[PDB]
Design a protein around this motif. Structure first.
Motif, PDB file in Angstrom:
ATOM      1  N   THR A 242       0.862  -1.168   0.000  1.00  0.00           N
ATOM      2  CA  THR A 242       0.000   0.000   0.000  1.00  0.00           C
ATOM      3  C   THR A 242       0.904   1.225   0.000  1.00  0.00           C
ATOM      4  OG1 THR A 242      -1.880   1.092   1.075  1.00  0.00           O
ATOM      5  CG2 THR A 242      -0.112   0.254   2.498  1.00  0.00           C
ATOM      6  N   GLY A 243       0.321   2.395   0.167  1.00  0.00           N
ATOM      7  CA  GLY A 243       1.133   3.589   0.170  1.00  0.00           C
ATOM      8  C   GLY A 243       0.344   4.739  -0.397  1.00  0.00           C
ATOM      9  N   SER A 244       1.010   5.878  -0.563  1.00  0.00           N
ATOM     10  CA  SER A 244       0.346   7.070  -1.086  1.00  0.00           C
ATOM     11  C   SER A 244       0.036   6.863  -2.557  1.00  0.00           C
ATOM     12  CB  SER A 244       1.250   8.298  -0.906  1.00  0.00           C
ATOM     13  OG  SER A 244       2.491   8.107  -1.563  1.00  0.00           O
ATOM     14  N   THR A 245      -0.809   7.728  -3.107  1.00  0.00           N
ATOM     15  CA  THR A 245      -1.126   7.649  -4.521  1.00  0.00           C
ATOM     16  C   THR A 245       0.111   7.920  -5.390  1.00  0.00           C
ATOM     17  OG1 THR A 245      -3.424   8.193  -4.297  1.00  0.00           O
ATOM     18  CG2 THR A 245      -2.335   8.731  -6.387  1.00  0.00           C
ATOM     19  N   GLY A 246       0.286   7.130  -6.443  1.00  0.00           N
ATOM     20  CA  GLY A 246       1.441   7.301  -7.305  1.00  0.00           C
ATOM     21  C   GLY A 246       2.767   7.100  -6.585  1.00  0.00           C
ATOM     22  N   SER A 247       2.846   6.097  -5.728  1.00  0.00           N
ATOM     23  CA  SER A 247       4.071   5.834  -4.989  1.00  0.00           C
ATOM     24  C   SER A 247       4.969   4.777  -5.604  1.00  0.00           C
ATOM     25  CB  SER A 247       3.731   5.447  -3.540  1.00  0.00           C
ATOM     26  OG  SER A 247       2.708   4.461  -3.474  1.00  0.00           O
ATOM     27  N   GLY A 248       4.499   4.109  -6.653  1.00  0.00           N
ATOM     28  CA  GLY A 248       5.305   3.078  -7.296  1.00  0.00           C
ATOM     29  C   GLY A 248       4.852   1.646  -7.044  1.00  0.00           C
ATOM     30  N   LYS A 249       3.596   1.498  -6.646  1.00  0.00           N
ATOM     31  CA  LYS A 249       3.040   0.190  -6.380  1.00  0.00           C
ATOM     32  C   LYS A 249       2.963  -0.650  -7.645  1.00  0.00           C
ATOM     33  CE  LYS A 249      -0.181   2.519  -3.733  1.00  0.00           C
ATOM     34  NZ  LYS A 249      -0.717   2.895  -5.066  1.00  0.00           N
ATOM     35  N   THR A 250       2.382  -0.096  -8.693  1.00  0.00           N
ATOM     36  CA  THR A 250       2.268  -0.841  -9.934  1.00  0.00           C
ATOM     37  C   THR A 250       3.638  -1.043 -10.567  1.00  0.00           C
ATOM     38  OG1 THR A 250       0.053   0.074 -10.322  1.00  0.00           O
ATOM     39  CG2 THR A 250       1.162  -0.965 -12.160  1.00  0.00           C
ATOM     40  N   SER A 251       4.537  -0.085 -10.376  1.00  0.00           N
ATOM     41  CA  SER A 251       5.867  -0.206 -10.951  1.00  0.00           C
ATOM     42  C   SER A 251       6.622  -1.362 -10.332  1.00  0.00           C
ATOM     43  CB  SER A 251       6.651   1.093 -10.782  1.00  0.00           C
ATOM     44  OG  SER A 251       6.199   2.054 -11.713  1.00  0.00           O
ATOM     45  N   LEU A 252       6.542  -1.503  -9.010  1.00  0.00           N
ATOM     46  CA  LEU A 252       7.228  -2.603  -8.320  1.00  0.00           C
ATOM     47  C   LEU A 252       6.774  -3.930  -8.937  1.00  0.00           C
ATOM     48  CD1 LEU A 252       8.742  -4.174  -6.202  1.00  0.00           C
ATOM     49  CD2 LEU A 252       7.132  -3.456  -4.472  1.00  0.00           C
ATOM     50  N   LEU A 253       5.513  -3.965  -9.334  1.00  0.00           N
ATOM     51  CA  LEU A 253       4.954  -5.147  -9.946  1.00  0.00           C
ATOM     52  C   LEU A 253       5.585  -5.371 -11.315  1.00  0.00           C
ATOM     53  CD1 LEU A 253       3.004  -5.369  -7.630  1.00  0.00           C
ATOM     54  CD2 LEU A 253       1.065  -5.171  -9.177  1.00  0.00           C
ATOM     55  N   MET A 254       5.668  -4.309 -12.118  1.00  0.00           N
ATOM     56  CA  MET A 254       6.264  -4.416 -13.456  1.00  0.00           C
ATOM     57  C   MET A 254       7.728  -4.850 -13.326  1.00  0.00           C
ATOM     58  SD  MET A 254       3.874  -3.587 -15.649  1.00  0.00           S
ATOM     59  CE  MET A 254       2.801  -4.463 -14.559  1.00  0.00           C
ATOM     60  N   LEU A 255       8.317  -4.487 -12.196  1.00  0.00           N
ATOM     61  CA  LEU A 255       9.690  -4.837 -11.894  1.00  0.00           C
ATOM     62  C   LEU A 255       9.790  -6.350 -11.837  1.00  0.00           C
ATOM     63  CD1 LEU A 255      12.312  -3.655 -11.355  1.00  0.00           C
ATOM     64  CD2 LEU A 255      11.735  -3.379  -8.940  1.00  0.00           C
ATOM     65  N   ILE A 256       8.816  -6.983 -11.184  1.00  0.00           N
ATOM     66  CA  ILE A 256       8.799  -8.435 -11.072  1.00  0.00           C
ATOM     67  C   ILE A 256       8.439  -9.041 -12.421  1.00  0.00           C
ATOM     68  CG2 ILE A 256       7.702 -10.425 -10.033  1.00  0.00           C
ATOM     69  CD1 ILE A 256       7.154  -8.782  -7.598  1.00  0.00           C
ATOM     70  N   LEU A 257       7.522  -8.418 -13.141  1.00  0.00           N
ATOM     71  CA  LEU A 257       7.152  -8.952 -14.441  1.00  0.00           C
ATOM     72  C   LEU A 257       8.326  -8.793 -15.399  1.00  0.00           C
ATOM     73  CD1 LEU A 257       3.469  -7.815 -15.164  1.00  0.00           C
ATOM     74  CD2 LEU A 257       4.296 -10.105 -14.690  1.00  0.00           C
ATOM     75  N   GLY A 258       9.354  -8.074 -14.963  1.00  0.00           N
ATOM     76  CA  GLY A 258      10.515  -7.878 -15.810  1.00  0.00           C
ATOM     77  C   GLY A 258      10.336  -6.799 -16.858  1.00  0.00           C
ATOM     78  N   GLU A 259       9.266  -6.015 -16.740  1.00  0.00           N
ATOM     79  CA  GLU A 259       8.993  -4.924 -17.675  1.00  0.00           C
ATOM     80  C   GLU A 259       9.796  -3.668 -17.328  1.00  0.00           C
ATOM     81  OE1 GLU A 259       7.455  -5.069 -20.368  1.00  0.00           O
ATOM     82  OE2 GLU A 259       6.629  -7.095 -20.156  1.00  0.00           O
ATOM     83  N   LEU A 260      10.426  -3.684 -16.160  1.00  0.00           N
ATOM     84  CA  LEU A 260      11.244  -2.584 -15.663  1.00  0.00           C
ATOM     85  C   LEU A 260      12.504  -3.252 -15.144  1.00  0.00           C
ATOM     86  CD1 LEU A 260      11.298   0.454 -14.873  1.00  0.00           C
ATOM     87  CD2 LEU A 260      10.331  -0.216 -12.669  1.00  0.00           C
ATOM     88  N   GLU A 261      13.665  -2.747 -15.528  1.00  0.00           N
ATOM     89  CA  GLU A 261      14.888  -3.367 -15.064  1.00  0.00           C
ATOM     90  C   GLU A 261      15.412  -2.766 -13.776  1.00  0.00           C
ATOM     91  OE1 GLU A 261      14.327  -1.486 -17.564  1.00  0.00           O
ATOM     92  OE2 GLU A 261      15.731   0.169 -17.204  1.00  0.00           O
ATOM     93  N   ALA A 262      16.014  -3.619 -12.972  1.00  0.00           N
ATOM     94  CA  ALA A 262      16.568  -3.202 -11.700  1.00  0.00           C
ATOM     95  C   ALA A 262      17.994  -2.692 -11.883  1.00  0.00           C
ATOM     96  CB  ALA A 262      16.552  -4.376 -10.741  1.00  0.00           C
ATOM     97  N   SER A 263      18.168  -1.375 -11.902  1.00  0.00           N
ATOM     98  CA  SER A 263      19.489  -0.768 -12.075  1.00  0.00           C
ATOM     99  C   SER A 263      20.535  -1.186 -11.028  1.00  0.00           C
ATOM    100  CB  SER A 263      19.346   0.751 -12.084  1.00  0.00           C
ATOM    101  OG  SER A 263      18.386   1.160 -13.043  1.00  0.00           O
ATOM    102  N   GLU A 264      20.090  -1.395  -9.793  1.00  0.00           N
ATOM    103  CA  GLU A 264      20.961  -1.828  -8.697  1.00  0.00           C
ATOM    104  C   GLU A 264      20.173  -2.838  -7.861  1.00  0.00           C
ATOM    105  OE1 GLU A 264      22.529   1.605  -6.434  1.00  0.00           O
ATOM    106  OE2 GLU A 264      22.049   2.791  -8.212  1.00  0.00           O
ATOM    107  N   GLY A 265      20.873  -3.605  -7.036  1.00  0.00           N
ATOM    108  CA  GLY A 265      20.194  -4.567  -6.191  1.00  0.00           C
ATOM    109  C   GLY A 265      19.945  -5.919  -6.831  1.00  0.00           C
TER     110      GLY A 265
END
Ligand SMILES: Nc1ncnc2c1ncn2[C@@H]1O[C@H](COP(=O)(O)OP(=O)(O)OP(=O)(O)O)[C@@H](O)[C@H]1O
Ligand SMILES: [Mg+2]
Length: 264
Positions: free
Chosen positions: A51-74
């Protein structure tokens, strides 16, 4: 399968913004971080509430797992098939049944199990042809909740190791949503590793792990118990309402955002 993320940071990349909708150039040019220092360790069969504030990156974290967004570090570890239920509930042309199954092998028990758990029985019983009722692209004459439940049944029916459910519970038929979260997310999927993006406190309370985001950053990560003691300010304010989970989706996110903007 479990899922681990150790000190993860993802930056805006071209196109990602376009996908997100289904400016951005500046965020990419500036090398702005969409998610910064994200850490989480989810064991098999556990449920993670995001959860979190509006537009905090919730859906993005998901795309991160789907591999649609690459993890620059970590480091990010997870394996197996992943099923994704997007915030936008899509409906392809065909019957309600056809929509729940799509490209998956039909197993009568599996199917009726999911329909029942998603509270779809109360809906299809209203139609002459029940789940053989034909829908058009977008399922326009259906309600927002009906569309979400079918969309949710489709993701759930798919056999995967990790399920990503983005905000399926955000419509007016709030009572049905409560049943659906209990029957489906909590019971039928009890042993499936799952991530639920939500703005209902009950979901944080029943989850195994919790992640609260704000401005693409991790405001809190831990158990619901650790949340009350390590973030009493936040905890007190949200628990202070009598029936927060029945407020509209928009009010809940509004209260959440303001509370997050206030307590750092
Ligand atoms: N439709 C959009 N138009 C412009 N920027 C967007 C849009 N959707 C997302 N963004 C940008 O991407 C960032 C992260 O958005 P993301 O969708 O990952 O957040 P979220 O927490 O899931 O959002 P929400 O609370 O709306 O569902 C936002 O801070 C914003 O800069
Ligand atoms: Mg979102």
């Amino acid at each position: 399968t479990g899922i681990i993320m150790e000190n993860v940071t993802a930056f805006w990349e071209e196109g990602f913004g376009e996908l997100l909708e289904k400016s951005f150039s500046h965020l990419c040019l500036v090398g702005n971080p969409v998610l910064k220092n994200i850490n989480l360790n989810i064991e098999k069969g556990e449920m993670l509430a995001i959860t979190g504030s509006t537009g905090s990156g919730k859906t993005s974290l998901l795309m991160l797992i789907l591999g649609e967004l690459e993890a620059s570090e970590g480091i990010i570890k997870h394996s197996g098939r992943v099923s994704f239920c997007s915030q936008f509930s899509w409906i392809m042309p065909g019957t309600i049944k056809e929509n729940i199954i799509s490209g998956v092998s039909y197993d009568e028990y599996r199917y009726k199990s999911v329909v029942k758990a998603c509270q779809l029985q109360q809906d299809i019983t209203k139609f002459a042809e029940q789940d053989n009722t034909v829908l058009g692209e977008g399922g326009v004459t259906l309600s927002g909740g009906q569309r979400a439940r079918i969309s949710l049944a489709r993701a759930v029916y798919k056999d995967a190791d990790l399920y990503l459910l983005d905000s399926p519970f955000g419509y007016l038929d709030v009572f049905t949503e409560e049943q659906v979260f209990e029957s489906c997310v909590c019971k039928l999927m009890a042993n499936k590793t799952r991530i639920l993006v939500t703005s209902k406190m009950e979901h944080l309370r029943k989850a195994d792990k919790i992640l609260i985001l704000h401005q693409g950053s991790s405001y809190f990560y831990g158990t619901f118990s650790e949340l009350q003691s390590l973030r009493p300010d936040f905890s007190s304010k949200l628990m202070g309402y009598d029936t927060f989970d029945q407020f509209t989706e928009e009010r809940r996110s509004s209260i959440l955002t303001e509370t997050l903007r206030r307590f750092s």
